[PDB]
Structure 1
Amino acid sequence: MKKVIGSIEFGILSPQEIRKMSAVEVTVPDTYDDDGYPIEGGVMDKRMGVIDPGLRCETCGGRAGECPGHFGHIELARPVIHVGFAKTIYRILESTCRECGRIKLTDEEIEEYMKKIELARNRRSEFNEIIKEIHKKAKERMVCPHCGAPQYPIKFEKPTIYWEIRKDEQGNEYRHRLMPTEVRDWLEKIPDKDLPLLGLDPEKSRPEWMVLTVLPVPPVTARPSITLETGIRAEDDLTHKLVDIIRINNRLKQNIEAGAPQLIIEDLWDLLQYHVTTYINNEAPGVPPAKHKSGRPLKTLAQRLKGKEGRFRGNLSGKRVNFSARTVISPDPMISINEVGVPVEVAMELTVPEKVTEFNIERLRKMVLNGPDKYPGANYVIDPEGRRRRIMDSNKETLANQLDIGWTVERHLMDGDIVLFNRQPSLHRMSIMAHRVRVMPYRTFRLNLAVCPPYNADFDGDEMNLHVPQTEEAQAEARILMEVQNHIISPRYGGPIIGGIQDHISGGYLLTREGAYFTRDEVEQMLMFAGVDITELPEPDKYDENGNPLWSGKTIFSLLLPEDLTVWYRNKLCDEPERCEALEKLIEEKLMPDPEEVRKLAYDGFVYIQNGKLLSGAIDKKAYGREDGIILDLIVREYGVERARQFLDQVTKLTIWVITHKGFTTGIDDEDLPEEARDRIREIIREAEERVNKLIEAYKRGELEPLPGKSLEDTLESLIMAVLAEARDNAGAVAEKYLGMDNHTVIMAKTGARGKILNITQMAALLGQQSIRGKRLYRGFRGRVLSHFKPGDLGARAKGFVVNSYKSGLTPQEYFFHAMGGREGLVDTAVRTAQSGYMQRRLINALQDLKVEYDGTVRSPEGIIVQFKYGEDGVDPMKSWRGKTVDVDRIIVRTLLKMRG
């Protein structure tokens, strides 16, 4: 029975409409009287509404909240020019004629412009181009075609001033200052037939209305008054401006009636026009902004709408919301990836309204009986009539008994409820997801660690927001569309995003590395800890001394895999390609080689899984990592989201147990290189410095050959930088060579768990060359960065090359150079964030509302067909195989192995 706004037609207002709309004429320039009691006819007249408690308005009455607010009006003594339509007024005046008010266009030109303007009038740009062409053709004319009168040129000034050069004696063309009255007379005589040629309709935009005669007064609610500490009742700046207008035009009316010299009348007219200009737009160019008592410009209507904190954006686009909470986040790997740990205190405050039905009457009755202080309780109860009651210890039993079908209970949060979890800034879609609730005692949100990469969150003080949907449709949408397990595959590149991080990968490597073996107790304990519902241990693999069974890590891992899974690939740990080549030959010869042969030719570097048995390989980042988790991707594509969730929840816990009970540490001796490596590194650095010095000497003698680089100095700098980069790379190569895989830091770097080789070579060999904006350090004194070097020195050390390492300590000059290097990265991030944010805002506003229709096409809001088939293929990038439309090889291999097996 309700209606909805189907369309809005914007138009300009009219003085008659202003008169009819308003309910009072504000003539008294006073705001408030003693003890309130607003002055009748004042800027706070009760006719326009009531804001304070205890009083009623007259047009509609009711409380302050009940009154919607009503419009007033002020009848100006003499017309003034609206600021927003100033340029349009100027164009109209300099295009149309003065006598007949008709456009300075010929009849046939009018006819052809009529024909083209209707043709394809939908597009705005071509419409404006036609308008500009018509304006130019009208302006170029001198004598009006309809009447032989000289259309004198008209000039415009930024603060809405028009003073055309009226004909003077001897054709001097004196610049007569136009007044709004004669401009109004000019505009009224304009006919309506040619109005469309001026870009104006004849119904909601009349050129006469473009000049003000009576302006409205916003309702009192629209201009609220806030009481200060001493009851100042400081009103909105709009009220102060309105008071100024009322006083000024009152005095203007007085001196108009008195018939004073017209110069004072003109001065008051200018003052009133300036005041109205500030009221419409306080920042309008060409006028001095009207500051308040403390020298602050008033925020008039124009500034109220615009801006980040303005009305249009930041007030309807976004706003503060109810049923939300915010607190810090702490890790918890013992919950499922689609659950969030909620403090018990938040659950007592946030509530979910539940309707009492037949199947939940018992639970709701019990929870109402629990009251608002025990945890599984409620706060408010809503009867079928509509009135809302509050639960208290006095009326717990009575309210519990009165509960029946149709009532509503505002219960506490419970396990299994659905909530929204968000982290700011919200860069992509996955920044908001839906997790199930699990209540916890302490005061921080608990988030599973595999879910960090989507939120891009770290437990170093980050805070996150939680939202609780209240309506059933919202809950269903959150449960079906935004469940965590539904977003395992990223829509940006078609690969997994919710995968293992750090300890998961490292513990996987430790578990499935070659030579790892586990006893009976360890196997049983880790299997129970992971949650696998095993009942009998498999047959022992190797018997050690004293006759104790031992199980390889591969068997324990394979217990977690599906029964029918076959895949093989090369991971990051590969270093001997010959072993992988031999294994590939064995697999390719016949697609099901005998398992014993594969165990014979096993090698960490070629992961191979045969019917759920891990035959050869070590867990790496390529297994279930954040970026290229092949096994996780295969499971989530071939079995389902539930199976992927179970697999992740098992492997994370198993790897955590392995890394916790096997021991994993890093220390000061993780960078203790032997003597030979140090001697080699010193030799490399000395050779590089000698080469740089030779280049510098060659440049000084002038024998340097200019590279295609324009400047000889730039060629020298490029050569020096290339030499230094090569030196650092060679030092890194030797440092990496001399550190084995028994080192824990090397394990963490190679598997991709944390860091890279650059960190190792910078902590063990040397930092290298420091630079800003791609150039060596040059800012400082004349010809030298620091006063400790001779001027004109271009050597390696003198410009930033640091030959020391973090372990060996830095000399003070190297320390200063390194600080100069790091400051650039800091400021780079600081500026990059803002630039990227602005770009994303522009892109979002550009492409916000495109969608896929039911026929497969993508259409613009008006109806234009952007694409005849989305993505040229019709396949969602999220469901694509890493950007491919379909993985043919995988399907062929899977089917062939399935049937032939």
Structure 2
Amino acid sequence: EFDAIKIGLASPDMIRSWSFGEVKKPETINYRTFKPERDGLFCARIFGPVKDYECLCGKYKRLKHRGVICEKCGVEVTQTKVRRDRMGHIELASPVAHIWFLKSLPSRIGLLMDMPLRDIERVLYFEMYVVTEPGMTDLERGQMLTEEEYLDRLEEWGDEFTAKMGAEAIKDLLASMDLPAEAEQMREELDTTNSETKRKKLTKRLKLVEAFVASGNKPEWMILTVLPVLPPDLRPLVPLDGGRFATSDLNDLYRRVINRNNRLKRLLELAAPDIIVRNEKRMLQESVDALLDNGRRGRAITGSNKRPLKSLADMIKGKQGRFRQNLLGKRVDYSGRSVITVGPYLRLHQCGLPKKMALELFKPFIYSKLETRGLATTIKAAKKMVEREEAVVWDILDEVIREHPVLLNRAPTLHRLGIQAFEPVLIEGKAIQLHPLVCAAYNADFDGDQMAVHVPLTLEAQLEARTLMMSTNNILSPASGDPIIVPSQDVVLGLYYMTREKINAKGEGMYLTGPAEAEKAYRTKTAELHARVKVRITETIKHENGKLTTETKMIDTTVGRAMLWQIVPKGLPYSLVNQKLGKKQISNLLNEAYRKLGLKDTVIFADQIMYTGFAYAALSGVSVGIDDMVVPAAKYTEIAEAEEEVREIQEQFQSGLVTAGERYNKVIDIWASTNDRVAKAMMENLSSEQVINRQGEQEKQESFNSIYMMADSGARGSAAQIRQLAGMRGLMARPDGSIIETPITANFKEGLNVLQYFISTHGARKGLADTALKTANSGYLTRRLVDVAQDVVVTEHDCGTLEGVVMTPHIEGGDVKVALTELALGRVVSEDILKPGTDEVLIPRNTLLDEKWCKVINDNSVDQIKVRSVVTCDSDFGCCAQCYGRDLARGHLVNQGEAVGVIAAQSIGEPGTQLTIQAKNNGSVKLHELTIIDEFGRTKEKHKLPYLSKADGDAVAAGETVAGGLPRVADLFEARKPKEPAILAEHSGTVSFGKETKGKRRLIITRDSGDTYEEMIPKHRQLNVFEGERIERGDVIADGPESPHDILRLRGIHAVTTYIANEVQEVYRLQGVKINDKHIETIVRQMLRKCTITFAGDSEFLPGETVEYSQVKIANRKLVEEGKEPARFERELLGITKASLATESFISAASFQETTRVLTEAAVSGKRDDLRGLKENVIVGRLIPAGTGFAYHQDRQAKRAQ
């Protein structure tokens, strides 16, 4: 129907054209008949009939008289909904300035007439005159005259000049401007100017003038002469229960405007003193600005209930505004909500749905089927049968829900796994039964959590639920590629208990034909779960090439291990089961099954694993008791020793040998050591036991303590919690941050006393409040990332670029932080991977590095590779498939139409709550910094070189001595400037000292061309450069934190990409969160979207103008095709907020935040929105140009092409 949305100024003729009448009175409704008045705010002649196909006087009261305007009353006989569309207008007695175009800094009016805002308000508030027409007089346009001066110069000259006061004067000045002449004047002066500040001033003014002349708008339209009036049903006056009436504040604001307008019209007939008329004009202006935007001008007007009246800008903007409350999110039908219980009998694709909920949600479907198969003649028959709850209704409900998927959601929806599709199973009850293996994706625990259920209606939605959102498809985490359905808690505990090994268990040394006879022996009480036996195992291996090799052997195992092997699918080695199975082991089992067998086998295996784990955890009988918390006897003696030594050091302090700070520090150290030793003793006592073996001696065995089994299996608990239960609680922190000297020498078994509990509360409160605030901080970060990266969709297959990024293993000392296999798994090769020391092509270009090629690279010892990345792609909009590579959630190449930006934003934002020289290897030494490389050719140590045992190329043996998380990420993504940044060498050249000017110092550099560049350095700066040294570009002059803007300007795109990726991944890896770097690179690509033109060239670009980089690239390609001088640009790093607010679409920018500024700028510039991204199509209800809708939009892009 429509392809674009245009925005611009509203002329008085246009506002009159929108209107169906003029509102003349502040009347709303009658106090007896409750009918609208003529010429009021609810007039039926202006806005439409109150009743469908009726008129106020009631003469024409049927559809026979449709479209006939009644002569007695004037009401058109039509539908009532026209009262939601028809507008009105008010003809203002005096012109009024628009508040948005005046007080939204920078002032468009003030910028246009080149006068300060205070001057314009002084004219508007009726304090000073302004000359409109100077005439044949020394006076100039726009110069102020006070009342006295106006009188003297009126006596001096008379009618030669014209001076006015108020909004009328501003209107005449705006209408008298000759925009092209002013534009030429600014162009010439800019051609002959030197100051940079005046350059910026005239650049903005010229941009505004050019925008006005191009958009077709007229400046005088910023002063309103006719005011539009909103349709009544959007500001309703409705009867409430009990006879009370409810109204919108817009009614009060409009009534004030109309009253003051009528009073002004009356005062201009009963000719009145100029002071009174001036005051009334002031009233009219204040009322109009209050109606448009309350609180911007000054004191916000309040109602009879003493809170500010809500204006139109408040309707439009904010968290409660129409964009975010009703357009980007909605309440939906066919939805329900209930508490969630656990269904251990369910399959991965099934969810338990209560019968009453299904009856309510699927009611139209039930009606349809009852009408179709004939038990209901009409729709009220079906409704009555459903209400009476007959049996056949239940069979019909079963048949409708037979294979109709439903969508389950849990708030907060941190990532796309928070909504998934399941096949419903009707259950008796009122609670939704949820499969345990999906809880980790939902972050759902059964302590009162509630879930929402949605019913997809159309066939397309059903097939999207079955194919995309179904639980069996989403088993890999899109953030990292790891399985997200890994078992936890009782499943892990059962698989651990069944796979443990006991000495001298019943049935030891027995020979079993296979897993079946192990099961038979366990069920017949011949052998225990933990008996060491020999079992015949038939094992089939599926190789990388697909070879299936089957072979049988006798293996020394445990009965439980064979019984578990019974459910392991064919194609997997038996070594994966022949061990005690913790959480890591089960995760490895599932990951290997997915890597070597596929998806269906993986889901069946996961279901069987969870069933078996539950069964054998129930059979184990694991329980917690007070005797399971064994307190080591060494704790009391260690506490006594620490206390005695603390007495000794107190004595030393009393002698003056040591100071107070030293005493504090070493007391902290001794208590920390005591805590560590008590924890070690408790672990050693808890983790072992002595048993009698078959031959009769004593043997050491791993303990079967319930708490130890709980901690070691990885089900619940870690060493810290057992330390708190059976060891020592340790040092705790005072609320300011300081650490109290005396620790809590008690655990939770003997219990704390009053003061120990008080110190515990000190930190407990801090933790809870920190979580409460950090949740909101992370949510706001995730929002910001989503709006910056929302437009990134895979739009192509190959972009045909040769650029790429260089990837090497991460080294932050003497050990590798992460191998290159992890960094390269799933990325496409950009430059051919030659074997080191050879010219053979091991890996061709445009190849996806899967597991097998990763193993090849690991075997051939490759250090540095080149791969395509999102930042280096050349696609005009979005990215291509090769530059992104594998999509982690699916395991194959990324498909066309995937919203990679939203995935990246969700992946980064989800873990936000969890957020807060001696050589050690043998090899050679290389100097660049210091690098120690193994004999295989891999760089394994990277060390700094401050301004050495071995020189360059000298071999070094082992041991030789050559000689705050979330705020950081948020600050990094907005590209903040550090408080004290590093001073960096602007240009490559020879350093030289300069005149130490008072206040702060200056330095100079001589370039290769002999030009001298001056630098402004503060006094307190430990300069590193020395005179006579040729420092390269990118060198550090003053040490300190590095600003990403400087890195981009002086080093390049790759440098800033690497910097951002490394720091954010340092923060994430500190807390043990694994996120792939392609998401971060998508965000960084969205940071690099604007360029400032330095050389204007011949293209329609002004110097120093920040424009979009893709537009410049397209223009430069066109100009190169035309053989004309292309533009020279510098690229800018923009923060996620500033990049989001500077999008080409003003709909997305207005829906993000700062709605007033975006709307004002777009209206002045006459912007046009093409609805190219996701948010715009979400607002207008269209299909998003991503995923299933992608093709659709492409078709339109063909139709507009033809």
Q: TM-score, normalised by structure 1?
A: 0.71
For 2:751 and 2:539, locate their aligned partners in 1 and report how far apart those are by CA, in whole Å. Answer: 52
Shift of 1:875: 2.4
Q: 1:685 aligns with which of 635, 639, 645?
A: 639
C-alpha change, 1:593 and 1:69, in structure 2 (3 Å) is: closer
Query: For 2:471 and 2:533, how far apart are their aligned partners in 1?
Result: 30
SS of match in other structure, 2:464: helix
1:473-552 matches, cutoff 5 A: 473-515=460-502, 538-539=516-517
Per the alignment, residue 24 of structure 2 pairs with 27
User: Per the alignment, do residues 665 and 394 of structure 1 end up closer, same or farther by CA in structure 2, a change over 3 Å counting?
Assistant: closer
Aligned to 1:766: 728
Aligned residue for 2:246, secondary structure, equals coil
* Whole-angstrom CA distance in 1 between matches of 2:533 and 2:480: 33
Give the SS at the match of 1:309. Answer: coil
Aligned to 1:311: 322
Residues 1:95 and 1:300: Cα distance change in structure 2 (over 3 Å): closer
**8 Å contact kept, 1:541–1:549:** no
Q: 1:148/1:564 Cα in 2 relative to 1: closer, same or farther (>3 Å)? A: farther
Which of 670, 685, 689 lines up with 2:628 in the alignment?
670
Name the residue aligned to 1:430: 417
SS of 2:352's equivalent?
strand
Counterpart for residue 529 of structure 1 = none
Q: Distance in 1 between matches of 2:523 and 2:462?
A: 60
Cα distance in 1 for partners of 2:468, 2:113 equals 58
* Aligned counterpart in structure 2 of residue 727 of structure 1, from 660, 674, 696: 674
**The residue matched to 2:494 in structure 1 has which SS?**
helix
Tell me if structure 2 keeps the 8 A contact 1:94–1:154: no
SS at match of 1:466: strand
1:749–1:757 Cα contact (<8 Å) kept: yes
Deviates more, 1:838-847 or 1:769-778: 769-778
Give me the whole-angstrom Cα distance separating, in 2, the residues matched to 1:603 and 1:546: 17
Aligned to 1:82: 98
Q: Which residue of 2 aligns with 1:40?
A: 38
Deviation at 1:427, TM superposition (A): 0.7
What are the equivalent positions in structure 2 for 1:402-481 lying under 5 Å apart?
Answer: 413-481=400-468
Q: Can you list the C-alpha shifts for 1:466-505, whole angstroms capped at 9, x where unaligned?
A: 1111111111111100111111111112211112111111
Structure 1: where are the runs of 5+ without partners? Answer: 97-141, 156-161, 171-175, 372-378, 382-387, 401-408, 521-535, 568-590, 706-711, 779-795, 886-901
SS of 2:501's equivalent? coil
Instruction: State TM-score, norm by structure 2.
Output: 0.54
State the alpha-carbon separation in 2 of the partners of residues 274 and 345 from structure 1.
57
2:541 corresponding residue in structure 1:
564
Query: 1:562: Cα distance to partner?
Result: 8.5
Residue 223 of structure 1 corresponds to: 235
Structure 1 residues 770 and 551: CA distance shift in structure 2, 3 A? closer
Pair 1:748–1:217, CA change in 2 (3 A)? same
1:368-410 Cα deviation digits (max 9, x unpaired): 5566xxxxxxx986xxxxxx985445999xxx9xxxxxxxx99
Q: Match of 2:111?
A: 91
One-letter code of the match for 1:736?
Answer: M
The residue aligned with 1:109 is none
What amino acid is the match of 2:616? V
Task: Tell me the SS of whatever aligns to 1:733.
Answer: helix
- TM superposition shift of 1:226: 2.3
How many pairs are equivalent? 718
| CA deviation after TM superposition for structure 1 residue 884, in Å | 9.4
SS of residue in 2 equivalent to 1:776: coil
Q: Is the 8 A contact 1:765 1:804 kept in 2?
A: yes
C-alpha distance in structure 1 between counterparts of 2:259 and 2:271, whole Å: 19
2:478 and 2:524 mapped to 1: Cα distance? 55
For 2:475 and 2:339, how far apart are their aligned partners in 1? Answer: 24
- Contact persistence 2:46–2:88 (CA under 8 A): yes
Give, in whole Å, the separation in 1 of the partners of 2:52 and 2:330: 30
**What's the counterpart of residue 969 of structure 2?**
none
Task: Find the residue that maps to 1:473 and give its secondary structure.
Answer: helix
Shift of 1:442: 0.8
Match of 2:744 among 798, 802, 827: 802
Secondary structure of the 2:339 match is: strand
Closer/same/farther in 2, CA of residues 467 and 719 from structure 1, 3 Å limit: farther
The 3-state SS of whatever aligns with 1:6 is coil
What is the DSSP-based 3-state SS (H/G/I as helix, E as strand, rest coil) of the residue aligned with 2:240? coil
- 1:273 pairs, out of 285, 298, 304, with 285
Could you say if the C-alpha distance between residues 603 and 720 of structure 1 is closer, same or farther in structure 2, counting changes exceeding 3 Å? farther
**Could you tell me whether the CA contact under 8 Å between 1:542 and 1:550 is conserved in 2?**
no
1:557, 1:177 → 2: CA distance? Answer: 106
Structure 2 equivalent of residue 776 of structure 1: 738
* CA positional deviation for 1:761: 1.4
Q: 1:191 aligned to 2:178?
A: yes
Take 2:263 and 2:523, find their aligned partners in 1: how far apart are those partners? 112
The structure 2 residue matched to 1:257, chosen from 266, 269, 272, is 269
**Equivalent residue, structure 2, for 1:291:** 302
1:854 and 2:807 matched: no
Partner of 2:767: 825
In structure 1, how many angstroms separate the alpha carbons of the residues matched to 2:88 and 2:488? 65
SS in 2 for 1:11: coil
Specify whether residues 618 and 195 from structure 1 end up closer, same or farther in structure 2 by C-alpha distance, changes over 3 A only.
farther
Q: Tell whether 2:18 aligns with 1:64.
A: no
| Amino acid corresponding to residue 807 of structure 1 in structure 2 | K
Is the contact made by 1:93 and 1:154 (CA closer than 8 Å) also made in structure 2? no
Contact 1:350/1:413 (<8 A) preserved: no
Taking the TM superposition and a 5 Å limit, the aligned residue runs for 1:141-152 are 151=140
Instruction: Output the amino acid matched with 2:359.
Output: M
CA drift of 1:326 comes to 0.5
Shift of 1:298: 0.9
Mapped contact 1:380–1:411 kept (Cα < 8 A): no
- Give the residue type in structure 1 aligned to 2:617: I
Output the CA distance in 2 between the equivalents of 1:603 and 1:39. 87
Deviations 1:700-735 (A, max 9, x none): 666548xxxxxx84x655544333222212111100
- Output the amino acid matched with 2:93: A
Query: Does structure 1 conserve the Cα–Cα contact (< 8 Å) formed by 2:410 and 2:452?
Result: yes
Deviations 1:272-309 (A, max 9, x none): 11111100111214x22111111121111011111211
Q: 1: CA distance between counterparts of 2:10 and 2:681?
A: 81
Shift of 1:415: 3.3
Aligned counterpart, 1:349? 360
- In the alignment, the residues of structure 1 paired with residue 19 and residue 519 of structure 2 have an alpha-carbon distance, to the nearest angstrom, of 93
| Residue matched to 1:129 | none
User: In the alignment, is the contact (CA less than 8 A) between 2:735 and 2:762 conserved in 1?
Assistant: no
The CA distance in 2 between the partners of 1:312 and 1:264, in whole Å, is 42
Query: Hey, what does 1:748 align to over in structure 2?
Result: 710
User: How large is the Cα RMSD of the aligned pairs?
Assistant: 4.5
Compute the displacement of 1:744 (Å).
1.2
1:18 matched to 2:30: no
- Paired residue for 2:257, among 234, 245, 270? 245
Alignment partners' CA distance in 1, 2:425 and 2:225: 65
CA displacement at 1:231 relative to structure 2: 3.0
Higher deviation after alignment, 542-551 or 322-331: 542-551
Residue 324 of structure 1 corresponds to 335
What is the letter of the counterpart of residue 348 of structure 1? L
Query: How far 1:80 sits from its partner (Å)?
Result: 1.3
Instruction: Give yes or no for contact 1:724–1:769 (8 Å, CA) kept in 2.
Output: yes
- Matches of 1:652 and 1:38, distance apart in 2: 68
Match of 1:816 in 2: 758
Cα distance in 2 for partners of 1:347, 1:70 equals: 42
